[PDB]
RNA sequence: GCCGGGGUGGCGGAAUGGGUAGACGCGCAUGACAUCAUGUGCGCAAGCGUGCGGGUUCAAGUCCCGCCCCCGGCACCA
């Protein structure tokens, strides 16, 4: 007999699948129905290795599944070339772009090719091509008529490394999103912006409906930030400017002791009296230079200056002054404050430090407050010493004094947002041009809708291409030496590029008509495909694409173009891999292990000294290594940097792939953080070819074997073995359709074993065929090779057009369970008796259990609780 | 501190309209010419066992009250 030999068939099914294209997309759906399965496109940057594959294989499980079910089926795929990703690598191997990427993408293609992937690839989109970033300029030109792009200066974040600046859902921990290692800093310079905040209520509002990770919603909802409250007008004292500051606690504006301006609010200096200024001015450029890393180095010390001006609470009426400190931001509200120490920690913290004035407006009800007040009362309560409006209600006060304030055209009811306008523009060579130009009469004139595209200079020189704090692009005369096509004079293209996440927020998009010419896709066509019914991807992109994505969705939809309003209607997340690393020597002596520095910094801790519990109980082990030393292993996420991959291409010569599949899908929760290791493979070496040999062992018995027969008319190990199918068809489909591919192949383990125990007392029947065509069908989306295989040697077209399995409820239906027999809550033992036995038929066939155990306790009872199901409750 | 998600064997992990806890797999242990078959929660045993302590019930991983710990994300948003 023979065995199964992947190399054999693997790479031939592919070559038959990309022949026959069954996951071409159709142009237009038709009445079958259709589903969108879709994995973020990969930046083009670096070697793929089973780390990456989780994702694009599960798609694929789940694209396959549903294309077998008849949906008609959009499997995409294309490269995420432009921005900082491909650029920052390109750069680090002095390499140009455009080869490091076209070169990347050979190299990714080749990899999902030989796991086993198929895609429509006739829909392939990539990015830095002109073909492509030109419709990227025809949205910024749409959004620019509709007023939600536009320039102005301000302190941006600069990344010293990236040599640009970077939005702020590019700051993570406060520093680089790339480089988690490089702090940021922030430098005065007029970018371009995208007014997202526009539509900060709808896309906070559309969450509701959604059905995504409750754990990703819920950081875009708290990045948002929605917030009622109050925007109240403070007048300066003898100037004629008023300062607009925010509050959701207006009904303390009678307890306002002092404003506090961010250090670069414009009033900070325009106010800043003469004799205060050498200060004032001395603490700006100290807060500039500063970062988040630092301030989050001070604490929460307050500090601030006094500007030396005053101001007129428009309530009280009187004079309060006028402070600056760094724990108000500017890019929040107003970057202004009405301090109020007796119902603020932060500002009554503040006051007591810089010996400024505590003023009670808010009394606490029933138990008065202790006077004089050594901590801020935040809670709701009476009012008082302010005006008319003592005794009443903090609550319904609120509401009445910015009805007041409304009244007098002193303030008014508004509602910030924490989200910041989106900052696309980077002084970077490889990225999508701004469609946009300079005149000096004209001023800032948008290009032509129909001069586009707008390409990039050809730049060569490899040392040219490089950010040295300025756009590369600042250096080509050649290139922005155009002229204004309003007026007609010298004019000057804006030098500055589209950040990467610009592109990839529509592409799901493109894909449903990648080659259109007259406009970024064909509405028809994308309302046929949307939305992505199914999304699988991360979580790191949580405040950014996620939300960056949907902001167009609805932009895009405001232009009718995309009937829908959220692009991605299933959004299911996948865990990182994760492989044993070596951590270097160790010196094992006794029960002691101890750490050379080289290792000990590597592992990340203090301690320079374990014991062989510490490092089981930190799930690591001392291994025996090539150089004849012990090394401490320790799983770790498996990345090029940690330098632990498993690279597809070797891995899939030197096994299989259908093998690294069955690893990687069952090895947990897909939801989960899975470890790949070598057992693991092993096992699905196992688990594989066990089918095989079931499968090969009855091949002739099988070819002789017709697969029909008359359901009920079972009986036997056949009768049930039937039911034992369907039982697992079930449980196959359901978790398919849930995502969970683990237990839903720990259930086709489960029936192959059942499958071999009915083979020890049966031949092959007509029920068995059947059980094995369902099986091989069963198999397809997870080991499609090794299904395709078997499944040729009985049956002639692929199992593409196989179909999915009909389940047969009726079949599912118990006759004679397995019942527990219990007395006084413990489970004596367990009979075996119809579902449907009446509690005289268990009761009686429970008296003489295997050891009589039910005897040998009950011999008195009191009342007996009996469920069909598997129980019966013998109360002694 | 806030929000989100979780504590189950040696390990990944199953099972919640209460009803034989530990499916499937990994590891380990015996029997055959790396591969199969069998066993495998702990304790020699009384007996005990889903983070802790009470409680409801014939029956609790599932429900109720109080509490501990772990991971992830924001962290001076007025
Ligand atoms: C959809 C894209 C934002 C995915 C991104 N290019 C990544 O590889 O993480
Ligand atoms: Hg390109
Ligand atoms: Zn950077
Ligand atoms: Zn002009």
Not at 126 to 145: A, V
Not at 333 to 352: L, S
Request: aromatic share 12%.
């Amino acid at each position: 007999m023979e065995k199964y030999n992947p190399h054999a068939i693997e790479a031939k099914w592919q070559r038959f699948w990309e022949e026959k294209g069954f996951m071409k997309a159709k142009d237009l759906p038709g009445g079958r129905g259709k589903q969108y399965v879709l994995v973020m496109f990969p930046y083009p940057s670096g070697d793929l290795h089973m780390g990456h594959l989780k994702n694009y294989t599960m798609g694929d499980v789940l694209a396959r599944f549903r294309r077998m079910q008849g949906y008609e089926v959009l499997h995409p795929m294309g490269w995420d070339a432009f921005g900082l990703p491909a650029e920052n690598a390109a750069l680090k191997f002095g390499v140009h772009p455009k080869d490091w990427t076209y070169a990347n993408i050979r190299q990714a293609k080749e990899s999902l090719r030989l796991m086993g992937i198929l895609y429509d690839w006739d829909r392939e989109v990539t990015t830095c091509e002109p073909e492509y970033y030109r419709w990227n300029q025809w949205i910024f030109l749409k959004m620019w008529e509709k007023g939600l792009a536009y320039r102005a200066k301000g302190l941006v974040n600069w990344c010293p490394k990236c040599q640009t600046v970077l939005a702020n859902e590019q700051v993570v921990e406060g520093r680089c999103w790339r480089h988690e290692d490089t702090p940021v800093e922030k430098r005065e310079l007029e970018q371009w912006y995208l007014r997202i905040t526009a539509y900060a209520e709808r896309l906070l509002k559309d969450l509701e409906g959604l059905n995504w990770p409750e754990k990703v919603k819920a950081m875009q909802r708290a990045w948002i930030g929605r917030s009622e409250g109050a925007e109240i007008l403070f007048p300066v004292e003898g100037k004629e400017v008023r300062i607009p500051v925010f509050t959701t606690r207006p009904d303390t504006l009678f307890g306002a002791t002092f404003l506090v301006l961010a250090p670069e609010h414009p009033l900070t200096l325009e106010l800043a009296a003469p004799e205060k200024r050498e200060e004032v001015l001395a603490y700006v450029e100290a807060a500039k230079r500063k970062t988040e890393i630092e301030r989050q180095a001070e604490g929460r010390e307050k500090t601030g200056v006094f500007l030396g001006a005053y101001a007129l609470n428009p309530a009280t009426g009187e004079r309060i002054p006028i402070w600056t400190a760094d724990y108000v931001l500017f890019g929040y509200g107003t970057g202004a404050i009405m301090a109020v120490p007796a119902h603020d920690q932060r500002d009554y913290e503040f006051a007591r430090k810089f010996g400024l004035p505590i003023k009670k407006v808010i009394e606490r009800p029933g138990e008065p407050l202790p006077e004089p007040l050594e901590r801020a009362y935040e809670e709701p309560g009476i009012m008082v010493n302010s005006g008319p409006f003592d005794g009443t209600e903090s609550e319904e006060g609120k509401r009445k004094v910015i009805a007041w304030l409304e009244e007098k055209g002193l303030g008014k009811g508004r509602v910030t947002y924490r989200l910041r306008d989106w900052l696309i523009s980077r002084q970077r060579y490889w990225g999508t041009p701004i469609p946009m130009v300079h005149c000096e009469a004209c001023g800032v004139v948008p290009v032509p809708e129909e001069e586009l595209p707008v390409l990039l200079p050809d730049l060569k020189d490899v040392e040219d291409i490089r950010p040295k704090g300025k756009s590369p692009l600042e250096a080509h005369p050649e290139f922005y030496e155009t002229t204004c096509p309003k007026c007609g004079g010298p004019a000057k293209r804006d030098t500055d590029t589209m950040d990467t996440f610009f592109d990839s927020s529509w592409y799901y998009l493109r894909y449903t008509d990648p080659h259109n010419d007259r406009l970024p896709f064909d509405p028809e066509k994308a309302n046929a495909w949307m939305p992505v019914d199914q999304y699988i991807g991360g979580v790191e992109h949580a405040v950014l694409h996620l939300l960056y994505s949907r902001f167009f969705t609805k932009f895009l939809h405001d232009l009718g173009m995309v009937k829908v309003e959220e692009p991605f209607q299933g959004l299911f997340t996948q865990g990182m891999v994760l492989a044993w690393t070596d951590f270097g020597p160790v010196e094992v002596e006794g029960s002691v292990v101890r750490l050379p520095e080289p290792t000990r910094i590597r592992l990340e801790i203090p301690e320079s000294a374990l014991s062989l519990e510490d490092v089981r109980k930190m799930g690591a082990e001392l291994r025996p290594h090539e150089d004849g030393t012990l090394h401490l292993w320790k799983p770790a996420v498996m990345s090029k940097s940690k330098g632990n991959g498993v690279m597809v291409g070797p891995f899939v010569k030197e096994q299989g792939a259908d093998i690294a599949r069955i690893t990687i899908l069952f090895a947990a929760p897909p939801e989960n953080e899975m470890v790949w290791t070598e057992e693991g493979v092993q096992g699905a070496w196992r688990f594989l070819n066990r089918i095989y040999r079931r499968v090969a062992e009855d091949r002739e018995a099988l070819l002789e074997t017709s697969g029909v027969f008359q359901a009920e008319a079972l009986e036997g190990k056949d009768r049930e073995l039937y039911g034992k199918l369907h039982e697992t068809l079930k449980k196959v489909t359901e978790d398919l359709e849930a995502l969970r591919f683990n237990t839903a192949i720990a259930a086709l383990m489960e029936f192959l074993n059942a499958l071999y125990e009915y083979r020890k007392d049966r031949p092959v029947t007509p029920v068995y065929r059947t059980a094995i065509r369902y099986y091989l069908q069963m198999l397809f989306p997870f080991a499609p090779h090794l299904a395709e295989e078997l499944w040729h040697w009985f049956w002639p077209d692929s199992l593409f057009e196989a179909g999915w399995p009909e389940l047969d409820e009726k079949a599912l239906e118990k006759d004679v369970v397995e019942v527990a027999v219990q007395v006084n809550g413990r489970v004596r033992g367990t009979i075996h008796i119809p579902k449907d036995a009446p509690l005289e038929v268990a009761r009686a066939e429970a008296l003489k259990v295997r050891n009589v155990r039910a005897h040998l306790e009950g011999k008195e009872v009191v009342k007996e609780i009996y469920v069909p199901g598997k129980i019966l409750n013998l109360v002694v």
